[PDB]
Amino acid sequence: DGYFKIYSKHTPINLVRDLPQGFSALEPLVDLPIGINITRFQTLLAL
Amino acid sequence: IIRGWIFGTTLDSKTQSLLIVNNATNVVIKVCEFQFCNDPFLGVYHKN
Amino acid sequence: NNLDSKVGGNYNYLYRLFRKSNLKPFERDISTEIYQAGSTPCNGVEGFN
Ligand SMILES: *[C@@H]1O[C@H](CO)[C@@H](O[C@@H]2O[C@H](CO)[C@@H](O)[C@H](O)[C@H]2NC(C)=O)[C@H](O)[C@H]1NC(C)=O
Ligand SMILES: *[C@@H]1O[C@H](CO)[C@@H](O[C@@H]2O[C@H](CO)[C@@H](O)[C@H](O)[C@H]2NC(C)=O)[C@H](O)[C@H]1NC(C)=O
């Protein structure tokens, strides 16, 4: 509806090469009144 | 190693677009007519 | 009007006259590329249709 939102969690893990089987919910974080057409996104890792 | 994201629909200054980035001094969030790099990333000097 | 209207016509106030589909609520469109009204493809700054 023209508003962009973020939710997050951080947690400690000990698994070598795959996403850990378990359950935990994410809290909300931000709201951003951008009002723009988004159809794609792109991640910035550092080199 | 993750720092953030682009979001948009043309990414080459034809339509306004969103930049989100957690850089070494602060987070920045900005909505502008950006011309993005062909391969956006944040470069780090790391020498021995 | 008593502030805004210019005797020669205040041509600094414009509205988007054509669009291919209706916009979603609270969407802003800054794309001013030439509206292909006809069945023709159309390119450059101008053309018939
Ligand atoms: C948001 O931007 C995209 C990209 O311009 C639009 O997606 C296009 O929609 C029309 C539908 O007739 C097609 O001609 C294009 O081929 C579509 N492109 C893609 C990449 O899907 C989208 O319609 C725009 N949203 C709004 C609300 O106008
Ligand atoms: C992270 O990116 C932001 C945005 O480009 C940088 O913020 C600028 O910082 C300088 C120095 O403090 C100021 O002169 C500018 O006015 C800031 N710009 C804005 C939009 O606030 C920030 O410096 C970058 N971090 C690093 C480590 O370079």
Per residue, what are the HEC states of B11-46?
Answer: CECCCCEEEEEECCCCEEEEEECCECCCCCCECCCC
CA–CA distance, A9 with A31 (Å, rounded to integer) = 16
* Residue C38 identity: G
Which of C27, C30, C32 has the most B C-beta neighbours within 10 Å, making it the best mutation to test the interface with B? C30
The CA distance from A15 to B47, in Å, is 29
Residue C9 φ/ψ region, left for φ over 0, alpha for ψ in the -120 to 50 degree band, beta for the rest: left
Three-state DSSP at C9 gives coil
* Residues sharing a CB contact under 8 Å with residue A17, sequence separation 6 or more, in sequence order: none
Structure determined by:
cryo-EM
What SS3 state is found at A40? strand
Resolution (A): 3.2
Six-digit token string for A32: 């951003």
Residues of A in contact with B21 (CB under 8 A): 44
Q: Is B16 exposed, middle or buried (0-12, 13-18, 19+ CB in 10 A)?
A: buried
**Pairing mode, strands A4-8 and A27-32:** antiparallel
The Cα A38–Cα A40 span in angstroms is 6
Contact (CB, 8 A) for B29 and B4: no
C21: contact with B, CB 8 A cutoff: no
CA B3 to centroid of chain Cα atoms = 9
